[PDB]
Amino acid sequence: GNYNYRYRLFRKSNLKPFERDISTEIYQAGSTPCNGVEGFNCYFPLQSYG
Amino acid sequence: ASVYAWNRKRISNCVADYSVLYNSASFSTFKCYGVSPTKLNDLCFTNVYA
């Protein structure tokens, strides 16, 4: 498994053309705020291809 | 019900509030495979099999 290549699974909004997002901030996927901490409906945006 | 005789409920002819189901913290697993969880309140379907 080559896991060195990652894609942005989670984001709040669609990008502009020729826009790059490298920010490793947490995503809030539920009603509960995450405060930078993983948990219930709190996921890392970058997941690797298997 | 048991898993060899799983109960099938037909959800139809009604308006469905998926936000209450999604915002509930009692569920330990909420994984969708054909739709988006945040777009369940926006899309429309013919019927739902539960």
Curated annotation (Swiss-Prot), chain A:
Phenotype when changing residue 7 to F: In strain: B.1.1.298
**Impact when changing residue 44 to S:** In strain: Lambda/C.37, Omicron/BQ.1.1, Omicron/XBB.1.5, Omicron/EG.5.1
Upon changing residue 32 to K, the result is: In strain: Delta/B.1.617.2, Omicron/BA.1, Omicron/BA.2, Omicron/BA.2.12.1, Omicron/BA.2.75, Omicron/BA.4, Omicron/BA.5, Omicron/BQ.1.1, Omicron/XBB.1.5, Omicron/EG.5.1
Segments for region (Disordered): 9-44
Stretches the record annotates as Receptor-binding motif = 1-50
Record annotation: effect of changing residue 38 to K:
In strain: Beta/B.1.351, Eta/B.1.525, Theta/P.3, Iota/B.1.526, B.1.1.318, Gamma/P.1, Zeta/P.2 and Mu/B.1.621; May enhance affinity to human ACE2 receptor
Phenotypic consequence of residue 38 to D: Increased replication in human TMEM106B overexpressing cells
Outcome when changing residue 14 to K? In strain: Omicron/BA.2.75, Omicron/BQ.1.1, Omicron/XBB.1.5, Omicron/EG.5.1
Impact of changing residue 38 to Q on the protein? Answer: In strain: Kappa/B.1.617.1
According to the UniProt record, where is the region Immunodominant HLA epitope recognized by the CD8+?
2-10
Cysteine pairings via disulfide bonds: 34-42
Chain's role: Attaches the virion to the cell membrane by interacting with host receptor, initiating the infection. The major receptor is host ACE2. When S2/S2' has been cleaved, binding to the receptor triggers direct fusion at the cell membrane. When S2/S2' has not been cleaved, binding to the receptor results in internalization of the virus by endocytosis using host TFRC and GRM2 and leading to fusion of the virion membrane with the host endosomal membrane. Alternatively, may use NRP1/NRP2 and integrin as entry receptors.
- Binding partners and assembly: Binds to host ACE2. RBD also interacts with the N-linked glycan on 'Asn-90' of ACE2. Cleavage of S generates a polybasic C-terminal sequence on S1 that binds to host Neuropilin-1 (NRP1) and Neuropilin-2 (NRP2) receptors. Interacts with host integrin alpha-5/beta-1 (ITGA5:ITGB1) and with ACE2 in complex with integrin alpha-5/beta-1 (ITGA5:ITGB1). May interact via cytoplasmic c-terminus with M protein. May interact (via N-terminus) with host bilirubin and biliverdin, thereby preventing antibody binding to the SARS-CoV-2 spike NTD via an allosteric mechanism.
Identify this protein by name.
Answer: Spike protein S1
Q: Which organism encodes this protein?
A: Severe acute respiratory syndrome coronavirus 2
